[PDB]
A paper describes a structure:
Bacterial (1H)-3-hydroxy-4-oxoquinaldine 2,4-dioxygenase (HOD) belongs to a class of oxygenases able to catalyze this energetically unfavorable reaction without any cofactor. Arthrobacter nitroguajacolicus Rü61a (1H)-3-hydroxy-4-oxoquinaldine 2,4-dioxygenase (HOD)5 and Pseudomonas putida 33/1 (1H)-3-hydroxy-4-oxoquinoline 2,4-dioxygenase (QDO) were among the first cofactor-independent oxygenases discovered and described. They are ∼31-kDa monomeric enzymes that catalyze an O2-dependent N-heteroaromatic ring cleavage reaction with concomitant release of carbon monoxide. Remarkably, HOD and QDO are members of the α/β-hydrolase fold superfamily. The corresponding catalytic triads in HOD and QDO are Ser-101/His-251/Asp-126 and Ser-95/His-244/Asp-120, respectively.
To provide a firm structural basis to the observation that the H251A replacement essentially abolishes catalytic activity, we solved the x-ray structure of this variant in complex with the QND substrate at 1.95 Å resolution. Overall, the HOD H251A·QND complex is essentially identical to the WT HOD·QND complex solved previously under anaerobic conditions. QND binds in the catalytic pocket buried at the interface between the α/β-hydrolase fold core domain and the cap domain. The binding mode is unaffected by the H251A replacement. QND carbonyl oxygen (O4) is stabilized by a hydrogen bond (2.72 Å) with the triad's nucleophile Ser-101, whereas its NH group bonds Trp-36 carbonyl oxygen (2.75 Å). The only significant consequence of the H251A substitution is the disruption of the hydrogen bonding network connecting the QND OH group to the His-251/Asp-126 dyad. Two solvent molecules (Wat2 and Wat3 in Fig. 5B) loosely occupy the position of His-251 side chain thereby engendering an alternative network connecting QND OH group to the carboxylate group of Asp-126. However, the lack of activity for the H251A variant suggests that this water-mediated network is unable to sustain QND deprotonation. The HOD H251A·QND complex spectrum displays a peak at 341 nm with a shoulder at 354 nm. Taken together these results indicate that in the crystal as well as in solution, His-251 is responsible for the deprotonation of QND OH group.
Author numbering: 3 to 275
Amino acid sequence: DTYLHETLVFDNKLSYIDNQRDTDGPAILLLPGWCHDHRVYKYLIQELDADFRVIVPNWRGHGLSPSEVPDFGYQEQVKDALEILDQLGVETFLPVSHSHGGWVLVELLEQAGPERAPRGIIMDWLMWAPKPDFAKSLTLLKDPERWREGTHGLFDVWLDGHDEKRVRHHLLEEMADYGYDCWGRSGRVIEDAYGRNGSPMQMMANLTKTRPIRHIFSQPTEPEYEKINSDFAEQHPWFSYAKLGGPTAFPAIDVPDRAAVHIREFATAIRQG
Ligand SMILES: Cc1[nH]c2ccccc2c(=O)c1O
Ligand SMILES: [K+]
């Protein structure tokens, strides 16, 4: 895109999107998951471009030119993101994550605190601890002999039987340059995050300062999954959710207008106190 930059962040050259829009805060900080980059957000960036400053960091070894890097996890993703924000002179921001980018978002909320990061939106992020199929996928990602098979199994799940042209392009073309260095790492980091924090829901509830967080998701589509979101929301005044009804696990791509209205809602709320 026109908006793509690169800067040195501690030891690493990281790319990032910044539309440099001069306007009222908060900045919208779109956070990628593992082994993809800002390209996942291109449609969402267009929905928001005009009214908001939009920043998208890419993680170590991530970007248009993936590279091998030393092992790191979500704690480092958080430090990386804040340093980029510091370099840009961004104070207040609304973080928005995709899938396991949520580990970065929640830890970012903790580290940045409620004045800098008063709310967050998490998109399509498995709220319960891994079921057998996903646990199996993580096991495959970690295997140097079966990692690609692992990614293919996830692509099947994420597409959910749909010939969704834009999401297919993202998975098959826009993730194609990522190798075992990333996918193995993602398997280890995500597996460790669940192991260490229990679940995304446990981690959020354990925040020192709880804050408005909304989970917007299209998948999984089963009633049992909606129920754990409804139950969590019943218990925690600060949590909400919305089932977006898109075909794939990538609503930022396949229902960008819907993702956008939820983001605008939270940004509008922040602007009113
Ligand atoms: C972009 C992205 N990357 C991942 C890497 C490993 C395991 C799960 C994920 C995931 O769910 C997701 O959406
Ligand atoms: K609630």
